[PDB]
Design a protein around this nucleic acid. Structure first.
Ligand code: SF4
Ligand code: MG
Ligand code: ZN
Ligand code: ZN
Lengths: 181, 435
DNA sequence: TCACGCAGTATCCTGT
RNA sequence: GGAUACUGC
């Protein structure tokens, strides 16, 4: 349910959808940001990594704004009341919808949604995880050589941004004392 | 001991008694959880594939431990920072997996088994010095009799245990038990008694250690299952812990097919009614359950089939386990007198409870009017000559011969070649002919 | 010579 | 399908 990373090529202007670190199969597999999605386009998005960084930050801002908008929808199908205002009148399950007074208001974009979106943006830039889990054996061998070290470094830098953002999220510390007692 | 270390991790092996108190990151949490899941799955696979004492088992387990960077070998150097890190990993990961593997008894058992295996391996890699260190740090106080006391009673121990050699005895360690627990040993005088304690023999020491470990671990898992509500509220850790066990790191469906060809007409009628209405009166339930037991449907398989079929009948799911589970178990000799009840014989079916309105059990050839039997035979595309012959046989009161004629016509065989006297015999013959 | 009605939940068994 | 219990209203 997470939005994929959309980046418009500076040269051709075609949208590139990124959902994994690597694209292709077998020896034809390469990092997604190595070649444009348009065959006629020779531009490498890895060249415009500053632009990719800026777009990533803008997307993170967009998702944080969506979360903090605090939109609530009534869970009742026959009400579906949409409000920004959280009422202080609560039932055992949560805020009581003030349109029908009989159903609970649920967040349109809960904290889990934002956390999963940030985790996905980290996932689409996790070189090591992709190599271990996603990639196959022959593909892993082909990707664990030189000719990709620069791409690996750029991917590490891009993942650093999402890691930094997630480090500032309360949904980034686990108190083991509270778990084990 | 670089920055924030301590004496919290003296030895490599531990009983995992004290929960961690640190504040870790979500990334560290996930990495540790997945890594230990990989380790435990590797342990399980190697245990299935190889004998745990085999050298291949040891080599592969060492390779996995090295790959995932878990403590497996001692180091007579000191507590190096890296070593500390590894031990910390182990300690936290274990408890995380506890949180993952305490929801269901099955899971609990699995966890315990894997953990025990790992512990055994690690013990097997401990030098005697290290071994003693461990046995001291956990207040196990095995010198379990001391070595000095063993030498003190060497001759008595030698003459106590049957078939124990001098050197082999030197290689063995005994235990001290109150004589009230060794009744079966003391009574025939096969264990030495000194001052109210028997010296019972067990390579074996690991066994005792493991016993202790297992006890503790089981208790811990119980407690964890008791403290589950506090964790379910933490959404961050719910997707992981609730699904870690499912983390990537005869069939019921064919029964319908069988009903096309192999099932005798009685079972065909019962199955048709069941799929038409998702409910059978008691006689039909008994007959069909016994038949499906006969074909080979296991208790789990039969339970699943009946659950799925009845749930569609607009009844509560719990109602099935409340009511029909006992009947299904009994048909397989699981409860009550616990008798492996045999499938109904054709004689029983003919002479069993007579079906009435709303029922579909019994032998159709006997409990179906001739017009109804003719219609049913026509429906199955039987040749007119075959239908007439079957009707003639039915009029002769030899319904078993009628079923034999049905088998001959449907299987395209001139002669059945067998005296049909059991529906399971019918199904077996059909399977033999087809497969 | 006897003995109130009905609605509902829980447990257990089906060889000669 | 049956059998044995005892709650409620
Ligand atoms: S003769 Fe036996 S197998 Fe054939 S329909 Fe009757 S009961 Fe079933
Ligand atoms: Mg009933
Ligand atoms: Zn392009
Ligand atoms: Zn509402």
């Amino acid at each position: 349910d997470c939005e994929r990373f959309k980046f418009f090529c500076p040269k051709c202007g075609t949208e590139n959808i990124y959902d994994n670190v690597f694209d292709g199969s077998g020896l034809q597999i390469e990092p997604g940001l190595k070649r444009c999605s348009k065959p006629e386009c020779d531009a490498s998005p890895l060249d415009y990594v500053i632009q990719v960084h800026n777009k990533l930050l803008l997307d993170i801002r967009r998702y944080i704004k969506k979360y903090y908008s605090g939109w609530l929808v009534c869970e009742e199908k026959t009400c579906q009341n949409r409000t920004r205002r959280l009422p202080l009148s609560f039932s055992r399950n949560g805020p009581i919808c003030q349109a029908c007074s009989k159903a609970t208001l649920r967040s349109e974009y809960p904290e889990k949604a934002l956390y999963t979106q940030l985790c996905f943006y980290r996932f689409i830039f996790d070189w090591d995880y992709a190599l271990e889990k996603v990639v196959s054996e022959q593909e892993r061998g082909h990707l664990k050589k030189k000719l990709f070290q620069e791409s690996e470094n750029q991917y590490k830098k891009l993942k650093s941004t999402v890691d930094q953002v997630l480090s500032r999220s309360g949904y980034s510390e686990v108190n083991l004392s509270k778990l084990f007692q | 001991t670089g920055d924030r270390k301590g004496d919290l991790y003296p030895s490599s092996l531990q009983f995992y008694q004290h929960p961690p108190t640190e504040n870790i990151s979500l990334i560290e949490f996930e990495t540790f959880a997945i890594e230990r899941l990989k380790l435990l799955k590797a342990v399980e696979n190697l245990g299935v594939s190889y004998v745990k004492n085999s050298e291949e088992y040891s080599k592969k387990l060492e390779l996995e431990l090295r790959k995932l960077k878990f403590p497996y070998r001692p180091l007579h150097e000191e507590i190096s920072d890296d070593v500390y890190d590894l031990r910390r990993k182990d300690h936290i990961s274990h408890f995380i997996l506890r949180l993952a593997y305490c929801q269901s008894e099955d899971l609990r058992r699995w966890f315990i088994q894997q953990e025990m295996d790992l512990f055994k391996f690690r013990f097997g890699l401990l030098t005697k010095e290290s071994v003693q260190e461990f046995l001291k740090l956990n207040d196990l106080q095995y010198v379990a009799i001391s070595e000095d006391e063993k030498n003190m009673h060497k001759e008595d121990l030698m003459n106590s245990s049957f078939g124990l050699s001098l050197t082999k005895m030197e290689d063995t360690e005994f235990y001290k038990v109150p004589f009230q627990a060794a009744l079966d040993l003391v009574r025939p005088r096969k264990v030495f008694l000194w001052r109210g304690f028997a010296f019972i023999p067990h390579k074996d020491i690991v066994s005792i250690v493991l016993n202790d470990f297992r006890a503790k671990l089981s208790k811990a898992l119980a407690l964890s299952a008791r403290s589950l509500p506090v964790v379910q509220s933490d959404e961050r850790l719910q997707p992981l812990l609730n699904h870690l066990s499912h983390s990537y790191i005869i069939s019921l469906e064919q029964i319908d097919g069988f009903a096309a060809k192999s099932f005798p007409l009685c079972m065909r009628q019962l199955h048709k009614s069941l799929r038409e209405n998702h409910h059978l009166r008691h006689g039909g339930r008994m007959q069909y359950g016994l038949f499906l037991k006969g074909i080979g449907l296991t208790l789990e398989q039969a339970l699943q089939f009946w659950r799925l079929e009845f749930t569609k009948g607009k009844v509560d799911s719990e109602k099935f386990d409340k009511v029909y589970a006992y009947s299904i178990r009994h048909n397989y000799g699981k409860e009550g007198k616990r008798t492996d009840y045999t499938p109904y014989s054709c004689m029983k079916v003919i002479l069993s409870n007579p079906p009435s309105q709303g029922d579909y059990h019994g032998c159709p050839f006997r409990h179906s009017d001739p017009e109804l039997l003719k219609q049913k035979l026509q429906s199955f595309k039987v040749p007119s000559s075959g239908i007439n012959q079957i009707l003639e046989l039915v009029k002769g009161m030899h319904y078993q011969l009628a079923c034999q004629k049905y088998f001959e016509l449907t299987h395209s065989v001139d002669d059945c070649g067998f005296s049909l006297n059991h529906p399971n015999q019918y199904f077996a013959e059909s399977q033999k002919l087809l497969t």
